[PDB]
């Protein structure tokens, strides 16, 4: 459930549905840490308050 | 950005 906060799409793929999927490189770790994250799973951050 | 890593 948390936010990490993501460096560099290193990969894409589609699914048999058709839709995107990203290999995501994490901010602050190397390229073991790599996931396929669906493309619904990338957020843009705007503060809340202002 | 950020993504939920799941």
Same mark, same amino acid.
């Given at each position: 459930?948390? +936010?990490?906060?993501? *460096?560099? /799409?290193?990969? $894409?793929?589609?699914?048999?549905? =058709? $839709?995107? *999927?990203? +290999?995501?490189?994490? $901010? =602050?770790? =190397? ?9 619904? &799973?990338? +957020? &843009?951050?705007? *503060? %809340? /308050?202002? | 950005? %950020?993504? %939920? $890593?799941?």
């Amino acid at each position: 459930g948390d +936010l990490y906060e993501v *460096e560099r /799409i290193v990969d $894409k793929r589609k699914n048999k549905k =058709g $839709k995107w *999927e990203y +290999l995501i490189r994490w $901010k =602050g770790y =190397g390229s073991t840490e790599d996931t396929w994250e669906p493309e619904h &799973h990338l +957020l &843009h951050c705007e *503060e %809340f /308050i202002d | 950005x %950020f993504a %939920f $890593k799941s």
